[PDB]
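Bench log, entry 3. Co-assembly request; chain sequences pasted below exactly as received.
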Amino acid sequence: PFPSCLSTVHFIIFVVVQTVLFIGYIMYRSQQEAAAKKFF
Amino acid sequence: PFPSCLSTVHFIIFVVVQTVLFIGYIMYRSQQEAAAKKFF
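Structure output for the full assembly:
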Protein backbone atom coordinates (compact mmCIF):
# COMPACT_ATOMS: atom_id res chain seq x y z
CA PRO A 1 0.00 0.00 0.00
CA PHE A 2 1.20 3.45 -0.97
CA PRO A 3 2.82 5.38 1.90
CA SER A 4 1.24 8.74 2.56
CA CYS A 5 3.60 11.02 0.66
CA LEU A 6 2.31 14.59 0.65
CA SER A 7 0.01 15.65 -2.19
CA THR A 8 -0.02 19.01 -3.96
CA VAL A 9 -3.71 19.68 -3.26
CA HIS A 10 -3.50 19.19 0.52
CA PHE A 11 -0.30 21.27 0.63
CA ILE A 12 -1.96 24.25 -1.07
CA ILE A 13 -4.92 24.04 1.33
CA PHE A 14 -2.77 24.04 4.47
CA VAL A 15 -0.53 26.92 3.33
CA VAL A 16 -3.57 29.08 2.53
CA VAL A 17 -5.14 28.13 5.88
CA GLN A 18 -1.87 28.96 7.67
CA THR A 19 -1.73 32.28 5.80
CA VAL A 20 -5.39 33.18 6.45
CA LEU A 21 -5.23 32.20 10.15
CA PHE A 22 -2.06 34.26 10.67
CA ILE A 23 -3.28 37.32 8.72
CA GLY A 24 -6.51 37.34 10.72
CA TYR A 25 -4.34 37.01 13.81
CA ILE A 26 -2.35 40.05 12.62
CA MET A 27 -5.53 42.07 12.03
CA TYR A 28 -6.91 40.96 15.40
CA ARG A 29 -3.63 41.92 17.10
CA SER A 30 -3.50 45.22 15.18
CA GLN A 31 -7.01 46.01 16.39
CA GLN A 32 -6.03 45.30 20.01
CA GLU A 33 -2.98 47.58 19.82
CA ALA A 34 -5.04 50.32 18.16
CA ALA A 35 -7.76 50.02 20.82
CA ALA A 36 -5.22 49.97 23.67
CA LYS A 37 -3.51 53.11 22.36
CA LYS A 38 -6.89 54.89 22.12
CA PHE A 39 -7.40 54.62 25.89
CA PHE A 40 -4.06 56.33 26.65
CA PRO B 1 -1.56 6.49 -12.33
CA PHE B 2 0.95 8.06 -9.97
CA PRO B 3 -0.37 9.99 -6.95
CA SER B 4 0.39 13.66 -7.49
CA CYS B 5 3.36 14.28 -5.19
CA LEU B 6 4.28 17.88 -4.40
CA SER B 7 7.19 18.67 -6.70
CA THR B 8 10.29 20.54 -5.59
CA VAL B 9 9.40 23.34 -8.02
CA HIS B 10 5.80 23.30 -6.76
CA PHE B 11 6.87 23.62 -3.12
CA ILE B 12 9.40 26.42 -3.76
CA ILE B 13 6.95 28.57 -5.76
CA PHE B 14 4.28 28.47 -3.04
CA VAL B 15 6.94 29.33 -0.45
CA VAL B 16 7.99 32.38 -2.48
CA VAL B 17 4.38 33.39 -3.18
CA GLN B 18 3.56 33.14 0.54
CA THR B 19 6.73 35.04 1.51
CA VAL B 20 6.51 37.88 -1.04
CA LEU B 21 2.84 38.41 -0.21
CA PHE B 22 4.02 38.40 3.42
CA ILE B 23 6.69 40.97 2.48
CA GLY B 24 4.03 43.12 0.84
CA TYR B 25 1.33 42.78 3.50
CA ILE B 26 3.23 43.55 6.71
CA MET B 27 5.07 46.45 5.03
CA TYR B 28 1.66 47.72 3.89
CA ARG B 29 0.49 47.50 7.51
CA SER B 30 3.39 49.48 8.99
CA GLN B 31 3.03 52.25 6.40
CA GLN B 32 -0.59 52.63 7.50
CA GLU B 33 0.63 52.82 11.09
CA ALA B 34 3.31 55.32 10.05
CA ALA B 35 0.70 57.38 8.18
CA ALA B 36 -1.69 57.17 11.13
CA LYS B 37 1.02 58.35 13.54
CA LYS B 38 1.82 61.30 11.24
CA PHE B 39 -1.73 62.68 11.54
CA PHE B 40 -1.94 62.50 15.35
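Helices of chain A lie at 8-38. The interface with chain B takes residues 2, 5-9, 11-12, 15, 19, 23, 26, 30 of chain A (CB under 8 Å).
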